[PDB]
Design an enzyme around this catalytic site. Structure first.
Site, mmCIF file in Angstrom:
data_model
loop_
_atom_site.group_PDB
_atom_site.id
_atom_site.type_symbol
_atom_site.label_atom_id
_atom_site.label_comp_id
_atom_site.label_asym_id
_atom_site.label_seq_id
_atom_site.Cartn_x
_atom_site.Cartn_y
_atom_site.Cartn_z
ATOM 1 N N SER B 76 0.882 -1.153 0.000
ATOM 2 C CA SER B 76 0.000 0.000 0.000
ATOM 3 C C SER B 76 0.925 1.209 0.000
ATOM 4 C CB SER B 76 -0.919 0.007 1.199
ATOM 5 O OG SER B 76 -0.204 -0.279 2.394
ATOM 6 N N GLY B 114 -8.279 -7.347 5.305
ATOM 7 C CA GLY B 114 -7.349 -7.535 4.200
ATOM 8 C C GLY B 114 -5.947 -7.078 4.601
ATOM 9 N N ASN B 138 -7.673 -13.425 3.152
ATOM 10 C CA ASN B 138 -8.200 -14.576 2.437
ATOM 11 C C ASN B 138 -7.072 -15.505 1.981
ATOM 12 O OD1 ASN B 138 -7.225 -12.822 0.473
ATOM 13 N ND2 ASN B 138 -9.026 -12.981 -0.856
ATOM 14 N N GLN B 142 -0.484 -15.781 3.722
ATOM 15 C CA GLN B 142 -0.337 -14.554 4.491
ATOM 16 C C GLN B 142 -0.587 -14.827 5.972
ATOM 17 O OE1 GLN B 142 -2.924 -11.755 2.372
ATOM 18 N NE2 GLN B 142 -1.105 -11.047 1.241
ATOM 19 N N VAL B 165 -13.712 -11.778 3.319
ATOM 20 C CA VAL B 165 -14.408 -10.839 4.178
ATOM 21 C C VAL B 165 -15.878 -10.723 3.769
ATOM 22 C CG1 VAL B 165 -13.913 -8.696 2.905
ATOM 23 C CG2 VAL B 165 -14.280 -8.632 5.380
ATOM 24 N N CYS B 310 4.905 -1.284 -11.218
ATOM 25 C CA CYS B 310 5.607 -0.211 -10.526
ATOM 26 C C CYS B 310 5.901 0.962 -11.463
ATOM 27 C CB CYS B 310 6.917 -0.704 -9.929
ATOM 28 S SG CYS B 310 6.667 -1.920 -8.612
HETATM 29 N N1 LIG Z 1 -12.618 -10.647 -0.137
HETATM 30 C C1 LIG Z 1 -11.457 -10.507 0.504
HETATM 31 N N2 LIG Z 1 -11.338 -10.973 1.773
HETATM 32 C C2 LIG Z 1 -10.168 -10.802 2.405
HETATM 33 N N3 LIG Z 1 -9.059 -10.207 1.962
HETATM 34 C C3 LIG Z 1 -9.206 -9.750 0.709
HETATM 35 C C4 LIG Z 1 -10.354 -9.843 -0.056
HETATM 36 N N4 LIG Z 1 -10.159 -9.264 -1.299
HETATM 37 C C5 LIG Z 1 -8.929 -8.820 -1.258
HETATM 38 N N5 LIG Z 1 -8.297 -9.073 -0.069
HETATM 39 C C6 LIG Z 1 -6.922 -8.707 0.250
HETATM 40 O O1 LIG Z 1 -6.858 -7.335 0.580
HETATM 41 C C7 LIG Z 1 -5.478 -6.919 0.412
HETATM 42 C C8 LIG Z 1 -5.383 -5.568 -0.234
HETATM 43 S S1 LIG Z 1 -3.628 -5.169 -0.505
HETATM 44 C C9 LIG Z 1 -3.233 -4.291 1.045
HETATM 45 C C10 LIG Z 1 -2.696 -5.247 2.096
HETATM 46 C C11 LIG Z 1 -2.393 -4.549 3.426
HETATM 47 N N6 LIG Z 1 -3.620 -3.885 3.966
HETATM 48 C C12 LIG Z 1 -1.274 -3.516 3.214
HETATM 49 O O2 LIG Z 1 -1.569 -2.319 3.373
HETATM 50 O O3 LIG Z 1 -0.128 -3.942 2.874
HETATM 51 C C13 LIG Z 1 -4.797 -8.022 -0.393
HETATM 52 O O4 LIG Z 1 -4.083 -8.824 0.531
HETATM 53 C C14 LIG Z 1 -5.989 -8.793 -0.954
HETATM 54 O O5 LIG Z 1 -5.662 -10.104 -1.353
HETATM 55 C C1 LIG Z 2 -0.113 1.270 -7.206
HETATM 56 O O1 LIG Z 2 -1.489 1.139 -7.648
HETATM 57 C C2 LIG Z 2 -2.195 -0.058 -7.267
HETATM 58 C C3 LIG Z 2 -1.514 -0.892 -6.589
HETATM 59 C C4 LIG Z 2 -1.901 -2.126 -6.059
HETATM 60 C C5 LIG Z 2 -3.434 -2.514 -6.429
HETATM 61 C C6 LIG Z 2 -4.033 -1.339 -7.249
HETATM 62 C C7 LIG Z 2 -3.385 -0.154 -7.640
HETATM 63 O O2 LIG Z 2 -4.009 0.849 -8.382
HETATM 64 C C8 LIG Z 2 -3.844 -3.895 -5.889
HETATM 65 C C9 LIG Z 2 -2.953 -5.109 -5.894
HETATM 66 C C10 LIG Z 2 -1.633 -4.672 -5.310
HETATM 67 C C11 LIG Z 2 -0.783 -5.596 -4.646
HETATM 68 C C12 LIG Z 2 0.591 -5.067 -4.040
HETATM 69 C C13 LIG Z 2 0.796 -3.830 -4.214
HETATM 70 O O3 LIG Z 2 2.053 -3.381 -3.646
HETATM 71 C C14 LIG Z 2 0.087 -2.946 -4.776
HETATM 72 O O4 LIG Z 2 0.614 -1.629 -4.799
HETATM 73 C C15 LIG Z 2 0.090 -0.709 -3.839
HETATM 74 C C16 LIG Z 2 -1.114 -3.122 -5.346
HETATM 75 C C17 LIG Z 2 -1.070 -6.990 -4.473
HETATM 76 C C18 LIG Z 2 -2.391 -7.390 -5.120
HETATM 77 N N1 LIG Z 2 -3.424 -6.355 -5.148
HETATM 78 C C19 LIG Z 2 -3.872 -6.105 -3.801
#
Ligand SMILES: Nc1ncnc2c1ncn2[C@@H]1O[C@H](CSCC[C@H](N)C(=O)O)[C@@H](O)[C@H]1O
Ligand SMILES: COc1cc2c(cc1O)cc1c3c(cc(O)c(OC)c32)CCN1C
Ligand SMILES: Nc1ncnc2c1ncn2[C@@H]1O[C@H](CSCC[C@H](N)C(=O)O)[C@@H](O)[C@H]1O
Ligand SMILES: COc1cc2c(cc1O)cc1c3c(cc(O)c(OC)c32)CCN1C
Lengths: 335, 335
Positions: B76, B114, B138, B142, B165, B310
């Site tokens: 994120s 998540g 999910n 993880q 969720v 990226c």
């Molecule tokens: N229906 C669902 N139930 C649970 N987790 C879910 C989901 N749909 C997506 N996710 C998870 O939600 C996460 C969003 S990515 C962000 C991950 C974490 N909050 C961070 O900030 O690093 C991913 O791990 C994705 O697989």
């Molecule tokens: C940068 O813009 C976006 C980034 C991400 C996204 C949607 C975006 O627009 C959703 C992806 C995702 C992931 C890892 C990750 O490091 C991400 O970057 C923040 C993203 C893993 C898989 N799913 C959650």
């Protein structure tokens, strides 16, 4: 040059329209500089600070009003389809717009909060004979005017509550609540919206129309010491211009269903029509006011106030072709 | 030149970074043209249409993730105070920002929806020893990763719910619910917010952080037939980019208390750090992936996907110095 100096010249009719418009435009320009931030991060910080702050908080003869405003004496932005749409047509078009957006249907109970001279109340009552329509106003003169008009129009489905809405207590509920350009005057908005929700059932809708800026909120007050205009128009701190989104943050008790704005040129054309009509009927207006005011000087003072309000409103709402100050509308249901 | 042609060259590493960036920037530029309307009236019509539409609706080895992301494998946007802030520092700073804005206090029950690789869960659990912190994901991988880290860090106040969720049913309530960059993946947002509210008491707060555009919403999908990028990154229609204000229209079950955005340069610097780290550890990354993927070609495919994500994210979030795509945050209480 001081405020007193500008005010002196203004009262004496020694400021030409071109200069007057220019001066007021500049005052609004400074408000835009005050309100716009360099980043969305800063814009939201500014806007949320304003929203948080909110959460802590003689009558003109009807003959004069008839001489200055449109046929139903609407005192809110109107809607102009064409360049040649008249103020009377624009009042009707805006009444119809409200009926469409508030989803008015025959048979409903309808409450119009701060109903003014009752143009909307009379429009709905005539169009929907099975609706009962209640106007609420804090003015005994307005109540009397509406009841007289209802009688003349053979309308049997109108009543008027004479009350300060902030003090009004009732168990009565209504299918539709309309608030047209009243919320700008409400000192406590969270409490206002809460009160409205107690007058709704699960089937009700609430429609609000308010003057706005598209981006930020502000109190209508002097931007600095060079601003002679704001405090001339509203000598009290009683008018707030909410941003177009401000009410989205007041959903404690109601829930948004729809959201619109109407471009500011409509309001600009409204105040322009009022100004031109007042100017046309200037002699008549001065004759009407003289009894109640006592002197030609007091008369001139009242006329200058109203005319300047229209001239200034023109510059405010026409700014950037209507894309700064405008009218916001929202539709809500009860929580 | 077709999609296939561009895709071919991309997979072969025959598009230089300069051209790749230029191409992706142009795709985002077209999205901006699609999303911005000439008047606020039209902008709100467009935005409300989108909001109304919403209301109708193999795992990478951890060694690879460790080689590409920061220390806690945050997935994120992070927060970079300085030009020389490292990704590890930026992860920590963003964890601290969330704790501040979500009003985390020692002793609270906390649910992270998540939770990904659990950086935030582990941060709160270590900082506030009397909090109990639950991550919900999910992904079994993880869950396993978080529990291992909690064990290594001598944290006794962590648990992980393995669940979709949208399907999870529980009577449990929490003092604080956090949703960091998960809502972009939620197919039914109104139902999602409703479900969250059932896991709150009157004392709870809900904090959401989501990628956004400051002005409009859009699905992350091909803008036209020349857009090879959007569908390469997300081959499914599974990601929505809400506007910075979109969630204000989802207050059926929760009520807004505060609202921020974080300028897009922070996200840009996050994806840049990931890209540079992946590039540095390229050889190692390819070695890690080879067992699970079966061939150097499949490996190259996975790496190209992530690296392009990226590179593209950089152009998206850095656009106009971070003032187009950015990160929105909101704080809510239960109705
Ligand atoms: N229906 C669902 N139930 C649970 N987790 C879910 C989901 N749909 C997506 N996710 C998870 O939600 C996460 C969003 S990515 C962000 C991950 C974490 N909050 C961070 O900030 O690093 C991913 O791990 C994705 O697989
Ligand atoms: C940068 O813009 C976006 C980034 C991400 C996204 C949607 C975006 O627009 C959703 C992806 C995702 C992931 C890892 C990750 O490091 C991400 O970057 C923040 C993203 C893993 C898989 N799913 C959650
Ligand atoms: N506390 C209060 N209770 C009742 N009416 C109020 C009020 N404060 C202001 N008002 C009235 O609200 C009106 C706003 S002006 C708009 C009038 C009418 N809705 C129209 O569109 O023409 C004015 O009549 C003002 O005097
Ligand atoms: C144009 O900008 C504004 C206009 C008005 C306002 C505040 C404004 O910013 C509040 C005043 C008012 C009135 C009649 C009227 O015709 C008005 O014009 C719409 C206004 C009567 C008194 N109170 C309600």
């Amino acid at each position: 040059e001081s405020i007193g100096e500008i005010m002196g010249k203004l009262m004496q009719g020694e400021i030409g329209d071109e200069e007057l418009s220019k001066r007021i435009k500049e005052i609004f320009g400074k408000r835009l500089q005050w309100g716009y931030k360099p980043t969305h991060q800063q814009q939201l910080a500014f806007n949320l600070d304003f929203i948080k702050s909110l959460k802590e908080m003689y009558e003109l003869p009807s003959a004069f009003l008839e001489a200055a405003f449109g046929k139903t004496i609407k005192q809110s932005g109107c809607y102009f389809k064409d360049e040649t749409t008249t103020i009377d047509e624009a009042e009707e078009a805006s009444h119809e717009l409200y009926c469409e957006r508030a989803q008015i249907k025959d048979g409903q109970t309808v409450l119009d909060i701060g109903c003014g001279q009752g143009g909307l109340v009379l429009h709905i009552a005539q169009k929907y004979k099975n609706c009962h329509v209640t106007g609420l106003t804090n003015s005994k003169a307005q109540k009397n005017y509406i009841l007289m008009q209802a009688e003349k129009l053979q309308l049997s489905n109108v009543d008027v509550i004479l009350a300060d809405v902030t003090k009004h207590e009732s168990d009565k509920t209504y299918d539709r609540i309309l608030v047209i350009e009243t919320i700008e005057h409400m000192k406590n908005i969270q409490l206002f919206m809460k009160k409205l929700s107690t007058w709704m059932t699960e089937d009700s809708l609430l429609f609000v129309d308010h003057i706005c800026h598209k981006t930020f909120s502000h109190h209508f007050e002097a931007i600095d010491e060079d601003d002679w205009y704001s405090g001339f128009i509203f000598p009290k701190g009683c008018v707030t211009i909410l941003s177009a989104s401000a009410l989205l943050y007041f959903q404690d008790d109601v829930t948004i269903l729809d959201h619109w704005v109407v471009n500011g040129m409509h309001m600009a054309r409204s105040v322009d029509a009022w100004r031109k009509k007042l100017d046309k009927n200037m002699e008549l207006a001065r004759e009407i006011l003289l009894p109640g005011l006592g002197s030609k000087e007091a008369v001139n003072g009242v006329i200058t106030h109203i005319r300047t309000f229209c001239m200034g409103g023109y510059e405010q709402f026409s700014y950037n072709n209507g894309e700064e100050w405008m009218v916001a509308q929202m539709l809500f249901k009860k929580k």
